[PDB]
Amino acid sequence: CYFPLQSYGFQPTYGVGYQPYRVVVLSFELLHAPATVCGPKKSTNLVK
Amino acid sequence: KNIDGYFKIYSKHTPINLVRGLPQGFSALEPLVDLPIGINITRFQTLH
Numbered sequence: 001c002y003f004p005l006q007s008y009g010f011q012p013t014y015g016v017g018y019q020p021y022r023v024v025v026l027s028f029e030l031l032h033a034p035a036t037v038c039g040p041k042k043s044t045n046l047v048k
Numbered sequence: 049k050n051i052d053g054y055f056k057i058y059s060k061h062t063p064i065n066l067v068r069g070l071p072q073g074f075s076a077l078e079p080l081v082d083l084p085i086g087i088n089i090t091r092f093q094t095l096h
C-alpha cells in the first residue's frame with residue numbers, strides 16, 4: 001500500500017539542484033478563435 | 049451583430065412625445081462597443 005504523493009521538506013542547507021525553485025510554463029493557442037492577447041505595439045513621435 | 053467572431057453594439061438615445069408608436073423622421077446609431085468573444089449566437093432574451 002502507498003500514499004501516491006511524497007512531500008518535499010525544503011531546508012536552507014540543501015545544495016544547488018536539491019534546493020526549491022519557482023517555475024512557470026507559458027502556453028498559448030493560435031488562430032482557432034480571434035486574436036485577443038498580443039504583444040505591445042511600439043510607436044514613434046508624430047511628424048508633420 | 050455577431051460577425052467574424054466579434055459581437056458589436058450600436059445605440060442612440062432621443063427624447064420623444066408620440067403616445068404609442070415608433071417616431072417619424074431620421075436618426076443614425078453610433079457604435080457603442082465591440083466584444084472579441086468568438087461565440088456562436090442563435091437566440092436572445094430581454095431582461096426587465
Ligand SMILES: *[C@@H]1O[C@H](CO)[C@@H](O)[C@H](O)[C@H]1NC(C)=O
Pocket residue numbers: 088089090
Ligand atoms: C453554431 O450553431 C449552428 C446551429 O446549431 C451549428 O450548425 C454550427 O456548427 C455552430 N457553430 C459553432 C462554431 O458553434
